[PDB]
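A brief tutorial aside. Many learners find it easier to grasp structure tokens once they have seen a single protein encoded end to end. The record that follows does exactly this for peptide A2. Read the sequence first, then the structure, and try to relate runs of similar tokens to stretches of the chain.
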Amino acid sequence: GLFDKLKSLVSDF
């Protein structure tokens, strides 16, 4: 859900 959004941004930059 949301907590998954922060995990995606950390994987990019």
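Self-check: Residues 4 and 10 are 10 Å apart (CA to CA). If you spotted this yourself, you are ready for the next section.
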